[PDB]
């Protein structure tokens, strides 16, 4: 297996990210909780006031080990997580030669880097009663949602348009219209340029083919890793509702993240929150679409699921060993969708792979079930291209895949 991505390499854009962005996120964290100050004494009282100034004491101080590149140092704060985290960090340091020194911002793998800040920001807060429940990342969160109202309706205005007229639609046109929520939860005709590797055909043969020959009381079991809140959320839930309205699958499974994570992605919290929004929305399409939706909850034909994996620096080619319930639990799939940039790096271990890699060897053992990741490029790791394709990329358009332009549906399994 090649070298992890980190900030070693000065040119690359892991070392852009640690060295500018990083410290941009750690700032604006730190500018929220300053804003909340007052709401905390209202609700808290002084000793609020003196947890808020605590966490944004920590923050500081995590803000300047990364500005001046210190070694990482083991979380202490009891914590489901605490211990495997340690361990873990233990193990990485195993990595490294004398030459190599102590584990640190710019030497260390990017994925374990950036994962390990996000676990000290929550450190720092449940390290802070009584405000250690607070998300520091919520007002965004929630900022997308409000802000994203008008794309909202139309999406669960198409949606329930769609399944009104659902079961007069032939196979062909039930295709076309997988496909095209497929590419909404992705980002459409301007757009498909942009989509460089589209194994979308075989989502649909695979389901397809399980909907033909699905036996009685059988399941067809879909599940979908999410990655951010707000319309990206809504996305898949609005893919969710056509899969089991459709008949495509029986069950969708649904795990996001146990912790505020990667600034934008969807906690338990915010999956309730927003269909709790949605739900008591009062325009008439969306309140449809979230009271069928906590209806589906309610049935168990949707399932959300926590697991501390998906918030652990660990690859997914780790999770057998590490996480055995887990993988285990994904080998139940007939389907696993994986969202996004960051599921992507943890998909392909967040190394240095060459562009003509299958995506196959990429996934270095990892093969629960049929999986999928439909994912814009916000890094530079790419597998599975033809000869030559991303070399073509490079040389035309150096910023191509990091800036989130260019879009991906790869699938490993049959077929
Ligand atoms: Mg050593
Ligand atoms: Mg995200």
């Not at 348009?161 to 496909?179: G, H, V």
Request: net charge negative; hydrophobic share 40%.
């Amino acid at each position: 297996v090649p070298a992890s991505l980190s900030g070693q390499d000065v040119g690359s854009f892991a070392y852009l990210t640690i060295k500018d962005r990083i410290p941009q996120i750690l700032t604006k964290v730190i500018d929220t909780l300053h804003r909340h100050k007052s709401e905390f004494f209202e609700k808290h009282g002084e000793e609020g006031v003196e947890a808020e100034k605590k966490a944004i004491s920590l923050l500081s101080k995590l803000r300047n080990e990364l500005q001046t590149d210190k070694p990482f140092i083991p979380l202490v704060e009891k914590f489901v997580d605490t211990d495997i985290w340690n361990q873990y960090l233990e193990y990485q340091q195993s990595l490294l030669n004398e030459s190599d020194g102590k584990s640190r911002w710019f030497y260390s793998p990017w994925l374990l880097v950036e994962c390990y800040m996000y676990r000290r920001i929550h450190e720092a807060i449940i390290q802070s009663p009584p405000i250690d429940y607070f998300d520091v990342f919520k007002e965004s969160k929630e900022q997308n949602f409000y802000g994203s109202q008008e794309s909202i309706i139309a999406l669960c205005t198409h949606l329930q348009q769609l399944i009104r007229t659902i079961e007069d639609l032939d196979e062909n046109q039930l295709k076309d219209e997988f496909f095209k929520l497929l590419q909404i939860s992705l980002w459409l005709e301007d757009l498909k340029p942009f989509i460089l590797l589209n194994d979308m055909e075989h989502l649909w043969s695979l389901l397809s083919n399980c909907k033909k020959t699905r036996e009685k009381a059988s399941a067809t079991r879909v599940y979908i890793v999410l990655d951010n809140s707000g319309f990206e959320l809504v996305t898949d839930l609005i893919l969710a509702d056509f899969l089991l309205s459709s008949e495509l699958a029986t069950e969708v499974h649904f795990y996001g993240k146990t912790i505020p994570w990667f600034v934008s992605d969807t906690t338990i919290h915010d999956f309730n929150w927003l269909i709790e929004q949605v739900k008591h929305s009062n325009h008439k399409w969306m309140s449809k679409c979230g009271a069928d939706w906590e209806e589906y909850i309610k049935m168990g034909k949707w399932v959300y699921h926590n697991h501390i994996f998906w918030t652990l620096p660990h690859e997914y080619c780790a999770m057998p060993q590490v996480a055995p319930d887990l993988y285990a639990e994904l080998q139940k799939a007939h389907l696993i969708l994986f969202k996004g940039d960051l599921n992507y790096r943890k998909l392909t271990g967040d190394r240095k792979w060459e562009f003509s890699v299958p995506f196959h060897q990429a996934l270095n053992g990892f093969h629960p079930a049929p999986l999928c990741t439909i994912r814009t490029l916000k890094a530079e790791i790419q597998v599975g291209l033809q000869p030559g394709q991303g070399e073509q990329l490079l040389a035309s358009e150096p910023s191509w895949w990091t800036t989130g332009k260019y879009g991906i549906f790869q699938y490993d399994g049959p077929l």
